[PDB]
Amino acid sequence: SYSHVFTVTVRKATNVTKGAIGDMLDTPDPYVELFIPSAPDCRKRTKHFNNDVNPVWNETFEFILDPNQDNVLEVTLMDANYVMDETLGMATFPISSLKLGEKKEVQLTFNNVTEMTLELSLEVCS
Amino acid sequence: SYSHVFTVTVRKATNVTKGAIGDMLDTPDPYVELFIPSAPDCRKRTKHFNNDVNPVWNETFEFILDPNQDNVLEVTLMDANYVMDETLGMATFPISSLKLGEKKEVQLTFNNVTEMTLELSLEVCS
Ligand SMILES: [Ca+2]
Ligand SMILES: [Ca+2]
Ligand SMILES: [Ca+2]
Ligand SMILES: [Ca+2]
Ligand SMILES: [Ca+2]
Ligand SMILES: [Ca+2]
Ligand SMILES: [Mg+2]
Predict the structure, then answer these.
(1) Strand partners, A22
(2) Would you list which residues of B are annotated within the binding site?
(3) What is the fold, at CATH topology level, of the domain defined by A1-126?
């Protein structure tokens, strides 16, 4: 049964970059995408901001999790385009590291120089 | 005598622009400069953020004011460069519109499309 509520708040990122050459062509237009393969709603995403290497989203998402399935959070940092969007990086979070009732601020890192702040919590359905 | 403490918190700006052509050449690298000609320290400024059209500064400044002088706040939105920095816009605030003990959130506008959030307060010296 799916009985665990996994809340993810994507707060902000700092120094988003496509690389030296990539940034010269196009200032990153970042959004974040959240993916849990084991969850019933697999994929979610934040809005994008144009031309902002330190975007602030403060968007909150809720997943419904099965405690008996392997649940892993995939966080993808994206650059929006008119053409096809570009994947800048990906970081994973083992949700099995959290414990019920726990709320935690997690900082992820992309391409060594980019950081992202998340706030993760886990509760029962009620 | 200088006996009024005028506190200014520059919080953030949204959609900073140098214009259509200017933005294509250079994504704004914004900072804010504060100027009160009648104050003993005339000029102050925030740090800049590279390539960020929605910068967040949250920097607090303190001016000392003479209640018998005309005190007007000049807010200049700047773009940082290696060369000479460029002036994007200027907005004024009559400090004689504030009351002692009053604390107020003010939103300024530059070039019709750029907004800036300030937090202004006025107290007497302790
Ligand atoms: Ca651009
Ligand atoms: Ca861009
Ligand atoms: Ca883009
Ligand atoms: Ca640039
Ligand atoms: Ca720039
Ligand atoms: Ca600049
Ligand atoms: Mg920003």
Answers:
(1) none
(2) 26-27, 29, 51, 79-81
(3) Immunoglobulin-like (2.60.40)
